[PDB]
Amino acid sequence: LKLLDNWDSVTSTFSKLREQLGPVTQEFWDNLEKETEGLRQEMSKDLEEVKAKVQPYLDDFQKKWQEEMELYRQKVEPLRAELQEGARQKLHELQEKLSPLGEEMRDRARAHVDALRTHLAPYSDELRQRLAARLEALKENGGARLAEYHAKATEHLSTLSEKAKPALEDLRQGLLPVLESFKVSFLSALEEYTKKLN
Amino acid sequence: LKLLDNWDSVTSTFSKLREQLGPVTQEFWDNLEKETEGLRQEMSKDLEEVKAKVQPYLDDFQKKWQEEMELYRQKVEPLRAELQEGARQKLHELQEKLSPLGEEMRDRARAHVDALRTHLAPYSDELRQRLAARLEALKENGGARLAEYHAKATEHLSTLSEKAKPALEDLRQGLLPVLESFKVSFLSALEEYTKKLN
Amino acid sequence: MTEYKLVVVGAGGVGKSALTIQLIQNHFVDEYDPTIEDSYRKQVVIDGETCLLDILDTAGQEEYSAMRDQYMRTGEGFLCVFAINNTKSFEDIHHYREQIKRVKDSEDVPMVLVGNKCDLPSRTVDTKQAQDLARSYGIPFIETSAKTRQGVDDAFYTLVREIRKHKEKMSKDGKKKKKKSKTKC
Amino acid sequence: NTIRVFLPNKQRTVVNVRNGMSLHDCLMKALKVRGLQPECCAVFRLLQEHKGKKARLDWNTDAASLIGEELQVDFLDHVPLTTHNFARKTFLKLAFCDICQKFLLNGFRCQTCGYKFHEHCSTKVPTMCVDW
Ligand SMILES: CCCCCCCC/C=C\CCCCCCCC(=O)OC[C@H](COP(=O)(O)OCC[N+](C)(C)C)OC(=O)CCCCCCC/C=C\CCCCCCCC
Numbered sequence: 001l002k003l004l005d006n007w008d009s010v011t012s013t014f015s016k017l018r019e020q021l022g023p024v025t026q027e028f029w030d031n032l033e034k035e036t037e038g039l040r041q042e043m044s045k046d047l048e049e050v051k052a053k054v055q056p057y058l059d060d061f062q063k064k065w066q067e068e069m070e071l072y073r074q075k076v077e078p079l080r081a082e083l084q085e086g087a088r089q090k091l092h093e094l095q096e097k098l099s100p101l102g103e104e105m106r107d108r109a110r111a112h113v114d115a116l117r118t119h120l121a122p123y124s125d126e127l128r129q130r131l132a133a134r135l136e137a138l139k140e141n142g143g144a145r146l147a148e149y150h151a152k153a154t155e156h157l158s159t160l161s162e163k164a165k166p167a168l169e170d171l172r173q174g175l176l177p178v179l180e181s182f183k184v185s186f187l188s189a190l191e192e193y194t195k196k197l198n
Numbered sequence: 199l200k201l202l203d204n205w206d207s208v209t210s211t212f213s214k215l216r217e218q219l220g221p222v223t224q225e226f227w228d229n230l231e232k233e234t235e236g237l238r239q240e241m242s243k244d245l246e247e248v249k250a251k252v253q254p255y256l257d258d259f260q261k262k263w264q265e266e267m268e269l270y271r272q273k274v275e276p277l278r279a280e281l282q283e284g285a286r287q288k289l290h291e292l293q294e295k296l297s298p299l300g301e302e303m304r305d306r307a308r309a310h311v312d313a314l315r316t317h318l319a320p321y322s323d324e325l326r327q328r329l330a331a332r333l334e335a336l337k338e339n340g341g342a343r344l345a346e347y348h349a350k351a352t353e354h355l356s357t358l359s360e361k362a363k364p365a366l367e368d369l370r371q372g373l374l375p376v377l378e379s380f381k382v383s384f385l386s387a388l389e390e391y392t393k394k395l396n
Numbered sequence: 397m398t399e400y401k402l403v404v405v406g407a408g409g410v411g412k413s414a415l416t417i418q419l420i421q422n423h424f425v426d427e428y429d430p431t432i433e434d435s436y437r438k439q440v441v442i443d444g445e446t447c448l449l450d451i452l453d454t455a456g457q458e459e460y461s462a463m464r465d466q467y468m469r470t471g472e473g474f475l476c477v478f479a480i481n482n483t484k485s486f487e488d489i490h491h492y493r494e495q496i497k498r499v500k501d502s503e504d505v506p507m508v509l510v511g512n513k514c515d516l517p518s519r520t521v522d523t524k525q526a527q528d529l530a531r532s533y534g535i536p537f538i539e540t541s542a543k544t545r546q547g548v549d550d551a552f553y554t555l556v557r558e559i560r561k562h563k564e565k566m567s568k569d570g571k572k573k574k575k576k577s578k579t580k581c
Numbered sequence: 582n583t584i585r586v587f588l589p590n591k592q593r594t595v596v597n598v599r600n601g602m603s604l605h606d607c608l609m610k611a612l613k614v615r616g617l618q619p620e621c622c623a624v625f626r627l628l629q630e631h632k633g634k635k636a637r638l639d640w641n642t643d644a645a646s647l648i649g650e651e652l653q654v655d656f657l658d659h660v661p662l663t664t665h666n667f668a669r670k671t672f673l674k675l676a677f678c679d680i681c682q683k684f685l686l687n688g689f690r691c692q693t694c695g696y697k698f699h700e701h702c703s704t705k706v707p708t709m710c711v712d713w
Pocket residue numbers: 053054057311321
């Protein structure tokens with residue numbers, strides 16, 4: 001009920017904020033001017049003197065860059081030839097390997113693949129005989145399981161219905177009065193709740 | 199009786215399931231035995247033939263592997279020789295560059311660093327002069343900022359006092375009857391819980 | 397390392413020492429050797445922290461002893477191990493349960509029920525019987541087997557877990573139990 | 582009949598013997614459980630008014646005659662106390678290594694003790710499993 005009373009005090013705080021804002025921003029403004037001008041004292045020096053820093057530094061750096069660049073042409077460039085020769089020799093070494101060993105590997109693979117034709121291929125067929133017997137077992141056992149499952153399904157249906165009937169019956173029989181009791185409790189609760197929170 | 203009766207229905211179901219479990223496991227184990235039995239006879243094919251045929255299989259692959267190892271060993275000898283001879287030449291060629299160009303790089307580094315030191319010498323001292331001005335600027339201005347900050351803080355503390363004393367007092371004195379009435383509602387709410395949930 | 401006082405009780409022939417040796421030394425026994433005073437201590441790690449389990453064996457073939465009351469009072473965790481292949485063991489638990497209550501001077505103590513020899517075909521006591529029993533006293537039940545070595549470690553870990561929650565619960569509940577009760581109208 | 586069987590360091594196993602069993606008979610019961618050799622061990626009886634040394638007894642001594650006496654089997658060819666036995670058993674729960682600054686994986690732990698350590702903690706922690 002005293003929402004305006006509290007709001008008043010809150011507004012007073014805002015009024016106090018305004019009372020501070022004025023002087024604070026005024027001196028802060030001058031402070032900012034102090035800082036800007038103060039920073040400008042060092043900034044002007046930094047900027048003007050940076051010319052006598054970046055320029056000679058870029059020159060000094062470029063001199064080293066030029067040196068290194070020229071040195072790279074006297075190192076990396078000839079080294080590229082050394083690399084080329086080294087690679088060419090390695091390629092030559094590789095050619096005398098990739099080709100002979102390649103054909104050898106292919107020939108090895110021939111003996112392996114061809115062996116698999118007498119190892120895996122026939123075994124795949126031999127496995128078929130076993131798989132056929134296994135599948136037959138799974139079929140006979142499956143047919144039996146199907147019959148048992150189907151039979152047990154009916155058995156479960158009878159047990160379920162035998163319990164579902166009394167379950168639903170009793171549940172309904174109990175739900176009727178229990179729901180009424182709940183309704184009474186809820187109604188009395190709501191009425192009282194509406195009294196507390198009115 | 200709600201939970202007890204509902205539970206009883208589950209108990210009967212569990213008991214019924216137990217009477218079914220027996221025949222189920224008895225028939226399942228019987229069928230499982232047929233499955234395992236078939237697999238036992240199949241074991242006299244799967245494992246028997248896998249071990250019987252593993253001999254020529256392993257012997258073939260092993261014989262071929264031995265040939266492969268032989269060929270690899272007969273090749274690794276001369277091939278490693280070319281690799282070594284080539285490596286020696288390639289490494290020596292690199293050394294023939296790593297020595298003169300390496301020393302040159304060291305000598306060039308001398309000049310590179312020399313110019314760096316010679317240039318950084320006045321630079322560092324000038325940086326000291328820069329830092330002096332930078333720090334002093336922030337020192338003179340800093341003192342002003344500290345003085346202003348202290349003043350602003352003090353003015354903020356006085357306005358804060360208006361919140362800590364007048365505002366807080368009214369807040370507490372205002373919240374007092376609110377808390378009291380709150381306790382009343384809470385008390386009645388406590389009763390509502392025990393009156394409806396117990 | 398946290399130290400835990402564990403005491404095991406049970407009838408004779410249930411395989412009480414079998415569990416200890418199988419858990420500590422990791423070996424199995426076959427000879428019926430009655431125990432009088434066995435002390436097994438192993439350093440393990442339960443729930444991150446190092447746990448030093450101090451287990452003291454009991455004498456299955458003994459009567460009321462004043463000395464037994466002594467060390468049993470020093471125990472914080474109690475394990476009621478019995479064989480489900482013997483009806484006597486299932487009944488004997490009632491005697492020990494009440495005994496511990498008197499020794500610890502408390503009606504509520506950390507106890508766990510364990511049915512050993514559960515892998516034996518001589519299982520006369522059904523799991524449901526033990527479940528309903530344990531539920532009535534507010535205690536857990538484990539189907540431990542020394543021969544198979546299954547459920548052994550966990551059976552002991554269960555006690556430690558409950559003990560930790562027990563000591564913690566003490567400062568949470570504060571022996572309050574309930575607040576106020578009210579009927580309709 | 583109460584035979585107080587004491588083991589090396591600080592262990593005790595009071596078994597129940599009867600009929601006509603000797604020390605070795607009871608020893609055999611513990612021997613299979615411990616998995617050690619009696620060759621490095623010796624049967625020492627209770628210090629019957631001694632200066633401060635164990636009294637070495639015979640292996641074929643009647644246990645019934647020692648009813649109420651404390652017998653201890655210490656090592657005469659080996660060292661007593663408990664040793665830090667290395668166990669390479671895999672973990673079940675991810676117990677964090679509060680000894681280090683990271684998590685603990687498939688590390689190692691002792692069988693007699695409970696020192697959890699990594700593959701680095703092995704030769705890192707100077708504080709071995711020595712606790713008095
Ligand atoms: C114009 C615009 C405005 C101005 C802009 C520029 C402003 C510049 C002002 C300041 C910049 C300073 C930059 C350097 C700051 C650190 C100086 C320093 O205090 O450096 C000390 C090191 C000590 O080395 P140590 O042998 O005692 O310890 C070796 C220990 N262990 C074995 C790991 C590696 O000095 C050494 O490392 C030197 C010997 C080792 C060198 C290793 C390779 C370093 C990388 C390149 C070569 C650099 C050569 C010159 C020295 C560079 C140092 C970073």
